[PDB]
Design an enzyme around this catalytic site. Sequence first.
Site, PDB file in Angstrom:
ATOM      1  N   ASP A  85       0.740  -1.311  -0.125  1.00  0.00           N
ATOM      2  CA  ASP A  85      -0.115   0.207  -0.156  1.00  0.00           C
ATOM      3  C   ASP A  85       0.746   1.348   0.096  1.00  0.00           C
ATOM      4  OD1 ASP A  85      -2.589   0.624  -0.417  1.00  0.00           O
ATOM      5  OD2 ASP A  85      -2.882   1.341   1.866  1.00  0.00           O
ATOM      6  N   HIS A 129     -11.160   2.311  -5.851  1.00  0.00           N
ATOM      7  CA  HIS A 129     -10.038   2.612  -6.477  1.00  0.00           C
ATOM      8  C   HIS A 129      -9.641   1.765  -7.830  1.00  0.00           C
ATOM      9  CE1 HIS A 129      -7.865   4.408  -2.583  1.00  0.00           C
ATOM     10  NE2 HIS A 129      -8.994   4.990  -2.842  1.00  0.00           N
ATOM     11  N   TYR A 133      -2.741   0.951   9.177  1.00  0.00           N
ATOM     12  CA  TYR A 133      -1.985  -0.154   9.136  1.00  0.00           C
ATOM     13  C   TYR A 133      -1.037   0.012  10.368  1.00  0.00           C
ATOM     14  CZ  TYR A 133      -3.572  -2.309   4.856  1.00  0.00           C
ATOM     15  OH  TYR A 133      -4.290  -2.882   3.938  1.00  0.00           O
TER      16      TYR A 133
HETATM   17 MN   LIG Z   1      -4.429   1.745   0.404  1.00  0.00          MN
HETATM   18 MN   LIG Z   2      -5.753   2.117  -3.186  1.00  0.00          MN
END
Ligand SMILES: [Mn+2]
Ligand SMILES: [Mn+2]
Lengths: 289, 289, 683, 683
Positions: B51, B186, B90
């Site tokens: 990410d 996304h 995260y």
């Molecule tokens: Mn993300």
């Molecule tokens: Mn994304």
Amino acid sequence: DFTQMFYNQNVKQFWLPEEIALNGDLLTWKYLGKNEQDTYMKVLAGLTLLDTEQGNTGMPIVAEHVDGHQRKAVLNFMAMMENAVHAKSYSNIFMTLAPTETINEVFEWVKQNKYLQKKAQMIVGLYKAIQKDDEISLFKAMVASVYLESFLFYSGFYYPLYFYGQGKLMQSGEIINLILRDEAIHGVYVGLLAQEIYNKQTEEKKAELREFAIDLLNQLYENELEYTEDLYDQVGLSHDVKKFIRYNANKALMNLGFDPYFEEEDINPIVLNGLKATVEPLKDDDFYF
Amino acid sequence: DFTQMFYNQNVKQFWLPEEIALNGDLLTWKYLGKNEQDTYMKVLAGLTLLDTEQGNTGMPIVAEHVDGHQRKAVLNFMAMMENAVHAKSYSNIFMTLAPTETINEVFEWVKQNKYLQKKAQMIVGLYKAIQKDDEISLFKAMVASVYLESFLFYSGFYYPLYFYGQGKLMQSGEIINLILRDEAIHGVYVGLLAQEIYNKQTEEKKAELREFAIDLLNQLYENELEYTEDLYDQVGLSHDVKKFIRYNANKALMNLGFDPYFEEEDINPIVLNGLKATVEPLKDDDFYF
Amino acid sequence: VPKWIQLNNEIMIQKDGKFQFDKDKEAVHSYFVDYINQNTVFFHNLKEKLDYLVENQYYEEEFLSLYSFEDIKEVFKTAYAKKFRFPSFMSAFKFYNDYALKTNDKKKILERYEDRISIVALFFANGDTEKAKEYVNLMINQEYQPSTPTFLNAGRKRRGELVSCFLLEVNDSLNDISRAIDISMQLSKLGGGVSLNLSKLRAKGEAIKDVENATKGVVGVMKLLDNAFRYADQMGQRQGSGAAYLNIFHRDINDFLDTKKISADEDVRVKTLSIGVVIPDKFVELAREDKAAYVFYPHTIYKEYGQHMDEMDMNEMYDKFVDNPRVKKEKINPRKLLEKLAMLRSESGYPYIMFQDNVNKVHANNHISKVKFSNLCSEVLQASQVSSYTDYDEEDEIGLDISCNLGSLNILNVMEHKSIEKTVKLATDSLTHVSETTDIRNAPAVRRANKAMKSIGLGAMNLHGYLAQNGIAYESPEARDFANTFFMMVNFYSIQRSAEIAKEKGETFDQYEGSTYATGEYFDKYVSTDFSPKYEKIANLFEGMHIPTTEDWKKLKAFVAEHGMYHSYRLCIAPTGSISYVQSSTASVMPIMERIEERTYGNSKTYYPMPGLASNNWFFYKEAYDMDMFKVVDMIATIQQHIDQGISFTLFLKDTMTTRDLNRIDLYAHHRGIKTIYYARTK
Amino acid sequence: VPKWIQLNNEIMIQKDGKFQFDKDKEAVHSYFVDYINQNTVFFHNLKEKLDYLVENQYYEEEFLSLYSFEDIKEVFKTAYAKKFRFPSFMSAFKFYNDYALKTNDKKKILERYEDRISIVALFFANGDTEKAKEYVNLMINQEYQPSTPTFLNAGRKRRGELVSCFLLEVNDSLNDISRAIDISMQLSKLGGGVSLNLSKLRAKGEAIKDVENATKGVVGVMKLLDNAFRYADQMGQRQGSGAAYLNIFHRDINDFLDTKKISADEDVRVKTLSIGVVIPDKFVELAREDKAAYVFYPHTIYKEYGQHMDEMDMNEMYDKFVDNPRVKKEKINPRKLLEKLAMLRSESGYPYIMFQDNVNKVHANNHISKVKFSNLCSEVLQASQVSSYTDYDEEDEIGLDISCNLGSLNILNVMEHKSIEKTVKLATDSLTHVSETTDIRNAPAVRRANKAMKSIGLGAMNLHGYLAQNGIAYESPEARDFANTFFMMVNFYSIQRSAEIAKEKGETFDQYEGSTYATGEYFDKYVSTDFSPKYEKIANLFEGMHIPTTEDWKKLKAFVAEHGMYHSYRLCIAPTGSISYVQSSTASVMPIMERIEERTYGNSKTYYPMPGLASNNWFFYKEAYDMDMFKVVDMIATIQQHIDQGISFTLFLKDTMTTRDLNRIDLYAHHRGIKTIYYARTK
Ligand SMILES: [Mn+2]
Ligand SMILES: [Mn+2]
Ligand SMILES: Nc1ncnc2c1ncn2[C@@H]1O[C@H](COP(=O)(O)OP(=O)(O)OP(=O)(O)O)[C@@H](O)[C@H]1O
Ligand SMILES: Nc1ncnc2c1ncn2[C@@H]1O[C@H](COP(=O)(O)OP(=O)(O)OP(=O)(O)O)[C@@H](O)[C@H]1O
Ligand SMILES: Cc1cn([C@H]2C[C@H](O)[C@@H](COP(=O)(O)OP(=O)(O)OP(=O)(O)O)O2)c(=O)[nH]c1=O
Ligand SMILES: [Mg+2]
Ligand SMILES: [Mg+2]
Ligand SMILES: [Mn+2]
Ligand SMILES: [Mn+2]
């Protein structure tokens, strides 16, 4: 020492133009003279252009070259605000107050206006001149960005603030105040990053960087004077706006760690008035009492 | 035809890490075996690392090369979510569940891991290969981006969803579900931008781009199978995870306007629990014959 | 903003650091000086008022014709001689907005509080002027309050049924399911809340006429019932309310529970159907020992044994079901199921929890049937027999469907008048009259069980109000001592009145001879344990009233043995939602949720302090959420030991406590003998 | 992939620019020499097969016990003597997948085509060996095809009901609504499609006993019925299919239609319940004149006149409804409503359109009742009387709920054998037997109507197949001439058989004396107009068969006057969806949708060419979508003039045409006398 607090401040300031209902401005808008409406539309269009480029180009490019995931997160957030929030809010205002043809005409007017094109050329040119691992080109672009945030917006901001302070166009004015609140913190933050780079230099190099900053400011200033006269002469306010932009030029210099360049003047007091539940497993001891 | 609609859906999904209190997860975390805790940590680090690439490179590079102010704004918003929201989320999950030394070691391990590195570098390679004014190279990068958003994350998402569907680690599972919901949109959005490029191509060029997409999918899929066995054999879940990978690969292909590659399969129910004709008026004399 | 609303909102405005509670009284005056008297229809005499109400189809002619006009006028004069005044604005507002009779155009007030009380008393007495005056004195002293159906509809021609709690047994057939849907619609049309037992229905994936994997389970029946309850919504006045109860050993129990999850799809979730889960002691034992449990397919058990799964004792039948190869079952984790119940109750307050063995170890009518499920409010616990609704032109086998008669004692008003015996006996007589005058022509088993069982529910309210106005904390041992003594006296006088009615009419309830009342077992704990107060303060509270001793209980046991008991069930503590406002009382025996509650009516805000709330008793009016739920469970169990049916027991949780705390409260309730748990309200 | 699958797919692989139709035949051979013969269960003789099927609860022993085993053996030998061969792979595949009897685990085939035909014939004959042989010869020649329920379930122990469609009248009451839901679930359990007339139910915003704006309208009942049909879904095998019919003058007609809008909310959208709209001639007249129309509240009309709105003629009572102040109505634009109907049919194919006046201007049983609605396939048009389902313990007034047995003549096989008369009479006898042995114990009105009306439906299939295989364009006037003559012959022989059955049994259908059959009016157009073919080609097609003239029709009219008619209704042309595959016939009298249809079964794909499709008749097999819908309307009206019930008329539309074209087609259908319109399928 500062990124985390800017991160928190930026995210806590998050807003969308749709939070503000604009139909309340319909009557005070209807009541303005044709000259006043023209200047107002053009002023916001000039702002839209600046935010378009700050969001599309300026903030993302600075984010790319600045090291550190948290610094990048702040700069990315600021970039989003520029084009996803600020630039868009102006269209919300336009779509409420103006018919489509007047909206089309003002966007055509930004494309052909020589002062607005010159200022975009100068600012975006510096953004696109940044070279990877070259801190001096980055500093120059950050100076340009501070000048956009803390100086260039203000020839535009004057007029919504001037009306807000008289109790006119107060919903549009509320949007503008939120935009201004954001730009103030954006200018401070980018200013602090610029100072970091400046402070790494020799005294000789620093002297050159001050020359760059002051030469750039003067060049932008002279162009902004002509832009201001072009927009405000028809509403009788050019001299007042000029005092306001000089005031804000000093704030931009201060954001860069430099001394004020223009002498203090009295600003229009009207404009000053314009400012699931948590789950635990069952233990064998929970079945006995 | 679609950017303003996606703008709306994106901004209305806005959220912040602070909204979910994480501490109550410790009440189920303490009851997991070592293999379960190990797999969870490794999966989490995998998602985090991928990410970060998307926030620092994937979204900003696509925003840079795509033309259109409104598209750039949506893409900026998505980049912001990666860097300002997802990355912090995260980190928060990690800091809650493991001590500092354990976090550093897991990231050292996952950073050296062959299967995680293979996919991370394959995706990053395509982002680095985009050339100015070359829509073919942009399309290839968009395909890579869709594969990350809509496919590669899901070998990882499986485990938090598996716990979430069982009533375990509910706070972090809620966070993961919000992240996943962002990555889904996304993937769909970038997919539409890729289809726009694809549809501008000749028939021979289209066939060539299809071959590229399928070949890339195959390489990533074969590595996902190895990645999956490496992480999930120790907790006995690999068979079901593989079904989930193929199901999400098919979604990624559909996002790119392509046919599904894999046969339809049912998904683990615990993970599931975690997850006009033209109107023409009658003209009279139509009642007479 | 009206003047009374300003005077009510002035309560929150603090003077000298104290709430202006007395201002509420002024509001009432305004609410009567500005609104109620202006919009109240007045007549030259009561004869004209009664003629206008009867002729315009407001009242019924039958109940008024049993009295001469002089007797009716005397009853009305007795009602008005009290000069009753509502002590708080919300009491009068709730009465005149919910219960006072209004014209067809809903702009004028035809009934005052005294008029409604007199009409209800005349309906209760059924022709006895002295009995009507006794009822008027009972209700104008606010010692006893008939339930919302009885209080609102008694004596009115345009009315629903006086019973609003109905329990239906659904047999495992399409004919029985369709009949259950029809009866639910008919009873919701009458304005009643309908509870259906779905445990006899076979689970999903069972055989219909020896074709496999054909049954939709209880979830399809729940969808049908939810649609039926949405359709039947009191002629578009209130949202149709229904409840479904499933045994926890039914295989559909997860899917059942899955109907209340937020993530459930539109074809799974039921929105207007409350759910309750019946938990036998076997499930609690399996969860306690962490042994994996089995959820059984009801139709396989019925085929193997000839009886439904919920019709036999699971404690002795579970091992035989598990060891039987012809009984189909699925492996589950009982602790996981308990955690799922706690999580669902945290999210939505569902399901209701029925501890089957806690109900049935003190059930007096186990010979008729064991209590298999509860009502929509989870306080009615009675024996029910399923009905066999056959095809057309074929005689149905009509069973027993529970429908008890609600009515609540005001503990504060009852005890300050030192009239536990008289109030309990008069309330029992009124409940008997309403049960006898109930005739439902579309629910055969409900009507048959009403005629046979003659079951009534006599509840209590203002327990926390009475305790707080007497300087007693709800969680204190003194409060539990008072509850023990008060409800033992209530049970004593309820049993005495039931036996007296049985002796007078010469008849008991059907199958009384097999009940523990007839065998004297019910009185065991009463002939050996003395329930006199153990604290001097509670004894002084009970001063002036004879507290039944063990000798009195022995005499009552002998009297019941000689004469029988008229009612199969007598006492059940209902939530008492809106009647607690009119009576200026705290709801049910529950602790108060808020000291002052803020409500929004129309575009106006209103403030209701708890009755008798002041600076001196502000601390004793502790909010329910701040209380220890274990001590609330202890108090509810203390009351439940003297209540033959259940008590609507809502859990009051903070957002901080987790599902482990909810499960611990549920398990302590099961340990302490709590029969039902109503709701898990999270603050 | 299977060998027969490859051979069937070899059809589309063109050789010399032509389709390989003959490959299809090869496929069938493969399908039999590799799958059917290996998967069939063979016994030593027929005795062992019959015993195994009887003791294993595959066959009912009662119908087989009426014959000695020698007679059953003779019937089976007669069935197998024809050496019937399926000419296409899809015919055999459809029979052996949908209609051939399989084992309990469905691993082997117990019934061949001859075995199934023999069992159905033995059930039909009811102990008559010669009649059983006649039925065997009729079905093995494929002249007549019993409906899917009858063909699939005749003589089976695990069978459902032999009746395909049921039509229910729902009275305006909660008891009647609940009974309708129950009966719908019961009949869907039996496997039949249920149609309910909701026109008597009062609209939304009506009063339930003096409290106004209380009713949920027909949409709430629609949701209840939708959930009922979802629950009762043939034990999860076939999705429960229901139909709701509403008069276009009902106030809820818009909301009704809004149930099928693709943008409808979940609280309004209904997805498993088909919708039909009944349009009187008054609505079409108002739309034609562009005068604003009025939809009516049924309950106000019932209160004012004592009869339901759909119980009387709108063409004569619409002005009285409008001018009556005591009748509540809402203003609508009839042209806008027509455009909404066209848009809805374009989007989803709904609603069904029933032209009430077109049905009732030739309806023979208007004295019993007017036809107010149709069935799920919009081809059953019969008199129905609503039932008064009262409260429990009260006697219900049982009305007439429509139900008829379906059976289709194969036009190609009937005319090839020159046996219109014999096939029609034998089919009428078989349908009479199916009606007589039908006894539904949970639908009282359906049972009473079956016993009294004795209505049957004798349809026809392979009209387009016969026309294309004989070089006649379906849109040509010659095709309409053939349809006129053939269906006049079918009507003549059906009336003759009905009168002969009435004579042999000494009984007619209930209330026959008031029918147009008894008065002789029905035969008017048959005793004055000659329906012999006007074209030489059609006359040659009818050679070897005695075409009834006006004298034969006069003799039949006298015979009916003397003896009466056994059946109230005889002819109805059902869609005949899947059983047309087995008969190698085009579906119903509709034109073919496609010349070769590609259907996906399992993971394989199969191509079914139209029966008899070849190079010489490729363009005679014109696809329905390419055809002029006006000429299809002309054909359907020509057939309809000889059919007493309706015809399932599906409209086949192109995507290019607008809703105005659909409205024009609907108005031309109404002008031409079309009774019902089934579907608007867009290519
Ligand atoms: Mn993300
Ligand atoms: Mn994304
Ligand atoms: N708190 C209250 N509760 C109920 N009714 C009230 C209340 N306050 C006023 N009313 C109504 O308004 C009337 C006027 O009462 P008020 O306080 O003015 O004096 P009063 O001496 O009780 O009057 P009255 O001559 O009506 O008996 C009462 O008789 C009663 O009907
Ligand atoms: N098209 C078909 N329709 C029905 N049954 C078929 C078909 N094709 C084959 N069969 C069945 O499979 C068997 C295979 O025999 P086939 O048709 O090849 O000819 P055969 O062995 O010469 O005998 P016969 O044709 O006289 O039955 C047939 O006897 C019949 O039972
Ligand atoms: C009970 C009820 C009826 N209805 C509608 C549907 C029925 O078609 C219609 C008739 O109900 P009924 O059962 O006939 O009610 P009723 O007989 O008591 O009232 P009335 O004397 O006026 O006939 O009312 C609802 O819409 N919702 C409901 O909850
Ligand atoms: Mg049964
Ligand atoms: Mg009625
Ligand atoms: Mn900005
Ligand atoms: Mn900025």
